[PDB]
Symmetry: D2
């Protein structure tokens, strides 16, 4: 088989999950009658210190229903220049909510509070209303970097003074929590809503969850219906979600250790990586000192049994997760070492 | 509890539960889930189309179809009492920026002539009619079957005008079972068809959209945008395969149970028209009862029967896999006792 | 050419041309155009409203109103043959992302009970009904006057449910002249009204929206987004002030001409209903002619008479300031000759 | 009041007022306004394009162009500080459902390589890059002129990828007078161009979009949808024709006044860069003043000079036909007095 370092989304269900899904107690969620979904949402709200939660088929929908519930047509959403909502969500914010993204550069996912402040639009007929500020914790593009709690706190203070909503794209908020030691409820305390994925490092086959106030979640639920996320006996999926949330968080530390090990060794080989920047499950490798670009290196890697994604023409992203063991990492490293000789 | 609210409440068969537990999966975003791929392969084959796309719900199936078939500002001709127009949260306006052009119909069948008259002529003031939608086994009219000839004639009109045709076939198999018309035959007269796996076919989640390759490619991107792009969705697809391949024939049982239920309810004295029961739905009027539909629904629940009121004077009863003949007979004994109380 | 196509073809009076040439202007984006400001003050005053907004067209007038009254996904109740649904290029769906909810009407008058029944109940499957629109002097039906009683009732219903009411008053003055109902009284039963200056009132460009200060503020911003935020628009407002203050009374002349036209056409043998002609429009059916509406329209054009077909069997004739009684007589001689050829 | 806020405040010349009063008009919706038709013919010819469209504002000109070049979910590459992104009410997201893709630029000139990298790869997660917009005489950077070579290289990239190119030429004639490059040459490297008549050219209302026949047809329909479809707009076009054919040359006077203003402000001690002033705009920084941009604008107003702050430390000064050398000289006396007070 292949050593899959493309993403943590490829994680497969554990034995415990397969069993729980196949024997899930279910109901029609449209009627709010699926017991497993209801327990998953109750558990999620509780974990994040929020009043309510909403299960969704993907993180993308989690983000989009949140944007829909937080905005009105013609509004502007302040977000990080390299955030997922801006680059990888098919421009849904424009089509679905009719809102404009207001890109603010960030240092490792951390937008400077004063830059966010300046990004807020003055009340002028020429300008749309800034109604939402979005923050991504463990910013993907920058290498799964951890946004400091103080950063989020400061932005919350600015949002409050202006009456602006705050949404945290916490797709990998648990990785951030494991790395920082900050409980997720703390990050959530400085936001109106938080979306987090169950289908990545937590290993569930499908789904993400949005948490927030009752009225917000009710609005998000209606948005979910409109977008087509209103499923029937979704308890089959939620069963795995419950296990992800309750038993797969602590072991994320193993993915971080594997990623750091990978980074340190890649550095020793001579690759352009920064082990000092690796705090969660991602490693960015630049092909600057290689005689091939990102795409060419990805092909050579595939040809040698290693799978990864090019994130630019000069950068590759390596992601660790439950289905890549330390031994798998060592195997990949031995291959990376030989390839270094070939392309250096 | 005897649940006659809708066929959406069907639960997974033992066969499905086993298949879900041992389902082979992969990341669908990369098109690497083997079970999802097989489900879509089977669905396309079944409806005689080039491709298929699995979606979380029928609503998304309809919406990605509309998006893939239209451009902002277009108009969509659809039946005045269709699900897309009534129960899809106005998604077509928000997601596709298109306007509905309601055409009345007789039990889901729009007069072909009225369809032709609803097509907008080319003029700067008018939107472009780019899609015509037909719902088979029309929900609101009481689960009626739209004649194949009606669909055939509308298709001809569409072709002559270069307009796409979408069949909302959430319950197209019920239509096929009742009419004897194969689903491929219905499909042949349409550009795309959405059908549900999560209703009478008993899958826990999902529907499927079938059509040409280019159409499906556009719909797949629309699905990503809407949030329907899942990961190891093979677990759901495993139940979906069983639903598509082995749960169709038994739909005849739901039809029989519905008719039997209607005939007996009429015998008791309830205001029902057994002659109108074509598929798995029975409409019950409450005009002769001491309490309206909402009050009667509560009496029913207290006695162990679940049903929905669709108006102050109407209740809809829906049969499905999880409503056996025994359950029907038990429900009738309850209806009998309640008639003595509320007539 | 005797132009009976629409009252939009009206050309500026000498008084207007002079007023435009000497118009005092400023930058409207800064709210500094004094002539625009006066036009809006006068418009608000005339309709008994708090504020007013000048727009480049009636279509923008209706659309900024819809945007200001609704949110994405909302539903808008409107008459089945209203201009907003048929002649505004599906703008409501694209610009506001809203769903139209057509309701049948008798010459523009929707039965109040049907409106009440069109209001969506609070359910996750349904959009929220946030607006009801009424067109006074309903175009399609032949410039018919909607009864004030009808408007009052719908207003009462709207209040109960907290729904906004917008009156498409493109020809509200024609309705007032014929009914004897002051435009301020019509306006009192609505949250917003759009009326045109560019039709019967003869201004070359523009309409105005009137309503509450906050609503107008939202409409103004919508106007900026749509591209209606002009600069020295006082040039157009000068003609607008004259249209609003000096051209209302003479509308009776267009009505007289329209009625006379209809009476004579009936005597010739054409399918018209002189008794239904109360303002400046005449609907002419072609069911008793050798050619349909499109064929008859071309014949009329070749003979010097311009009109538009509103369907395959109906032609709309409209009178206005640029059509004198003499022009009507000449037209009648032409219609007389064409009846011999096509009856 | 000496108005240096913008060139939008320009008022009609006597020649224009007379032309508007004597304007030959018609109903534009039927394409029958002779003056609008000639303005569009002239605009098209002037820019070396086959068609043109008159619009109520530059904002609508840009937006109908975006609508006609894109499909829902598309992405539009544009300069980070461009008007379309910052000053058009987020209209591109609402009207066309498209995403802006900001690219840094040096005085309006995006590096061609950056543009190349901003184009989205074909992937399900990414919107399709279907349009690249370029603003000539980039407003925010001080009315800077984008080099013809920059537009030429971007055009090559666009062609290579089958992507449309739109030039926001609101002040493209200022660019042409300063650079010596004919507007038809800039436009030769674009698919469409929008230019304003209501700014430095002194028309009271409007802009014009030029491009291919089909594109313009789509833009015309978009205009109808947005509410820009006017009637006897010839009154406005009459002034537009004069603006286009007689007000271009004198733009050099505005540039001369801007330069003179910059040189004297520098001489006084203000933070300005005369070397950066190539058209009708001067950027003044408040860095060496005991007050911020907002406080300074207030001081200028109390002394009789109007200007706009574009940031907390920068104010924009704009020259035009209604700010003569005398006014500049008078303004300088005020600036001199204020410098003593705030330095
Ligand atoms: C920060 C972030 N946010 C939102 C999403 C969307 O979730 P879905 O894929 O479930 O829609 C992703 C997925 N990112 C894919 C990856 O990093 O490989 C993500 O990384
Ligand atoms: C009732 C009504 N409402 C709104 C509009 C739109 O106004 P503009 O044409 O200025 O956009 C019209 C024009 N109707 C076309 C006609 O009767 O000739 C109309 O008749
Ligand atoms: C480059 C540019 N583009 C488009 C527009 C929009 O045109 P309208 O204002 O006619 O909609 C403006 C106006 N700019 C105002 C100013 O700079 O003072 C502009 O400067
Ligand atoms: Ca997974
Ligand atoms: Ca090893
Ligand atoms: Ca089911
Ligand atoms: Ca007119
Ligand atoms: Ca001007
Ligand atoms: Ca002098
Ligand atoms: Cl169960
Ligand atoms: Cl909204
Ligand atoms: Cl597997
Ligand atoms: Cl589109
Ligand atoms: Cl003036
Ligand atoms: Cl004229």
């Amino acid at each position: 088989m292949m050593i899959d370092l493309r993403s943590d989304t490829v994680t497969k269900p554990t034995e415990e999950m397969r069993k729980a899904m196949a024997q899930a107690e279910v109901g029609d969620d449209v009627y709010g009658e699926d017991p497993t979904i209801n327990e998953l949402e109750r558990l999620a709200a509780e974990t994040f210190g929020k009043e309510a939660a909403l299960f969704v088929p993907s993180g993308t929908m989690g983000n989009q229903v949140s944007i829909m519930a937080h905005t009105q047509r013609g509004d502007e959403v302040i977000l990080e220049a390299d955030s997922h909502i801006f680059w990888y969500e098919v421009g849904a914010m424009a089509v679905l909510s009719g809102v404009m993204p207001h890109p603010v550069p960030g240092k490792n996912g951390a937008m400077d509070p004063d830059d966010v402040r300046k990004a807020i639009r003055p009340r002028n007929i020429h300008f749309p209303r800034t109604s939402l500020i979005a923050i991504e914790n463990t910013h993907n593009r920058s290498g799964g970097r951890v946004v400091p709690l103080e950063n989020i706190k400061e932005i919350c203070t600015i949002a409050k003074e202006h009456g602006i909503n705050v949404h945290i794209d916490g797709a990998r908020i648990f990785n951030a929590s494991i790395a920082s030691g900050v409980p997720v409820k703390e990050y959530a305390g400085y936001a109106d809503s938080v979306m987090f994925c169950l289908s990545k490092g937590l290993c569930a086959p499908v789904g993400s969850v949005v948490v927030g106030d009752r009225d917000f979640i009710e609005r998000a639920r209606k948005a979910r219906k409109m977008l087509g996320g209103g499923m029937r006996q979704a308890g089959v999926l939620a069963a795995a979600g419950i296990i992800a949330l309750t038993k797969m968080v602590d072991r994320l530390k193993e993915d971080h250790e594997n990623a750091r090990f990978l980074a340190l060794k890649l550095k020793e080989i001579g690759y352009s990586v920064n082990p000092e920047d690796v705090k969660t499950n991602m490693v960015i490798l630049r092909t600057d000192n290689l005689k091939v670009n990102a795409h060419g290196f990805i092909e050579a890697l595939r040809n040698s049994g290693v799978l990864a994604n090019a994130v630019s023409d000069t950068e590759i992203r390596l992601v660790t997760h439950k289905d890549v063991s330390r031994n798998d990492i060592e195997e990949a490293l031995n291959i990376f070492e030989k390839l270094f000789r070939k392309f250096s």
